Amino acid sequence: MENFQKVEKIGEGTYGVVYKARNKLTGEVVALKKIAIREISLLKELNHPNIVKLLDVIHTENKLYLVFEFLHQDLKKFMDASALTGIPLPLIKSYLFQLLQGLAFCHSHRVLHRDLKPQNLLINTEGAIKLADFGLARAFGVPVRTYTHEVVTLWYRAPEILLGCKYYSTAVDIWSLGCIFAEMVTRRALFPGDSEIDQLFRIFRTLGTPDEVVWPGVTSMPDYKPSFPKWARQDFSKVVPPLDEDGRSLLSQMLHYDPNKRISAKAALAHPFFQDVTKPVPHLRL
Ligand SMILES: CC[C@H](CO)Nc1nc(NCc2ccccc2)c2ncn(C(C)C)c2n1
């Protein structure tokens, strides 16, 4: 649209191209997504420090542009830049702290993300990290292949979604974040599934195959089969070295199979892992 000179293609998303753009009324650099209206108009109203601010919604000539605040880098790029040294733990801890603050905010207005991953986690030079694309998956889709036929990752999907629950809760977000948490620590994807049954089975081999004892009602889920192989749970000390006892208790609590048992975001901010949070500035050049 006309009020915006786009100055860069930032990237192909799930729903559209994103451009860095110079709003020439306000003069402000801004991120322009080219893509329900009741829904995405609702989002304009939920602003948190750790949620990427939806500035405007432009439905002109029956198209959809969403104008957001601009952040300089995403988490996935930053994990790749920090591959040989790893992200320092005080940084990992503070980023997790902030994310749970943002999750705790949306979850109380009953907005889920439900497609979290390193790629829609965005960071600035200050030491802040924000959550991007919140509320959109509800508004349209979360599809299997994007608009450019890229396969949407299954790596972070909560197992009740994989097992065919259609009434996900906010717990599916705490699941994903446990997966991103573990990955920030090991420098290696927790559950790197390449199909839905590979994803299911990758979870099972590590956490153990779920039954009626740990997960009440799993065996009557839509896509549960009695023929699932029965694997044994692994020790978290083998799964996420060198994470400490506090981190691992937290991580297993976010990775609980039963969604009712899985730790809430508000409760995670009170876990002893976060007793010593600081806010460090990260090493990042632009
Ligand atoms: C949600 C994922 C999106 C595309 O993969 N990434 C991205 N990346 C942004 N910045 C990453 C970046 C900044 C500068 C250059 C290259 C990439 C960004 N800023 C605002 N937004 C809105 C659309 C959420 C941004 N979105």
Q: Are residues 28 and 78 in the same domain?
A: no
Q: Are residues 207 and 279 in the same domain?
A: yes
State the distance from the centre of ligand 1 to the C-alpha of 86, rounded, in angstroms.
22
Experimental technique used to determine this entry:
X-ray
Residue with tokens 């509800």: 138
Q: Are residues 34 and 112 in the same domain?
A: no
Pure H helices in the chain: 37-43, 75-81, 89-108, 136-139, 159-162, 171-186, 196-207, 236-239, 245-254, 265-268
Choice among 115, 194, 244, 246 that is catalytic: 115
Query: What Rg do the C-alpha atoms of the chain give, in angstroms?
Result: 19
CA nearest neighbour of 254 among 271, 279, 241, 242:
271
CA nearest neighbour of 43 among 110, 116, 93:
110
State the distance from the centre of ligand 1 to the C-alpha of 179, rounded, in angstroms.
21
Q: Are residues 131 and 31 in the same domain?
A: no
**In this structure, what CATH number is given to the domain that contains residue 280?**
1.10.510.10
Copy the structure tokens of residue 188.
């290696």
CA nearest neighbour of 222 among 196, 203, 202, 204:
196
Q: Are residues 62 and 81 in the same domain?
A: no
Q: Which of 72, 87, 117 is the last residue of a domain?
A: 72
Q: Are residues 137 and 243 in the same domain?
A: yes
Q: Which domain holds residue 116?
A: 73-284
115 is catalytic: yes
Which residues line the pocket of ligand 1, CB cutoff 6 A?
A: 10-11, 13, 18, 31, 33, 52, 68, 70-74, 119-120, 122, 132-133
CA nearest neighbour of 255 among 204, 194, 185:
204
Q: Are residues 59 and 136 in the same domain?
A: no
Quote the CA–CA distance of 75 and 92 in Å, as a whole number: 11
Out of 12, 18, 121, 153, mutate this one to test ligand 1's pocket (max ligand atoms within 8 Å of CB): namely 18
3-state secondary structure of 21: strand
* Reported structure resolution in angstroms: 2.4
What is the full DSSP assignment across 115-130? ---GGGEEE-TTS-EE
Quote the CA–CA distance of 242 and 261 in Å, as a whole number: 26
Nearest protein Cα to ligand 1, atom 21: 31
Q: Are residues 194 and 63 in the same domain?
A: no
Element (H, E) at 34: strand 29-34
CA nearest neighbour of 116 among 142, 140, 93:
142
Q: Are residues 172 and 202 in the same domain?
A: yes
Out of 8, 9, 10, mutate this one to test ligand 1's pocket (max ligand atoms within 8 Å of CB): namely 10
Between the CA of residue 56 and those of 13, 17, 32, what are the distances in Å? Answer: 18, 16, 10
Copy the structure tokens of residue 136.
């959109």
Q: Which of 72, 96, 111 is the last residue of a domain?
A: 72
Which numbered atom of ligand 1 lies nearest the CA of 66? 23
In sequence order, what are the residues at sequence separation of 6 or more whose Cβ sits closer than 8 angstroms to the Cβ of residue 249?
A: 271, 273
Q: Are residues 59 and 109 in the same domain?
A: no
**In this structure, what CATH number is given to the domain that contains residue 33?**
3.30.200.20
Q: Are residues 101 and 211 in the same domain?
A: yes
Q: Are residues 65 and 86 in the same domain?
A: no
Q: Which of 34, 52, 72 is the last residue of a domain?
A: 72
Count of domains forming the chain: 2
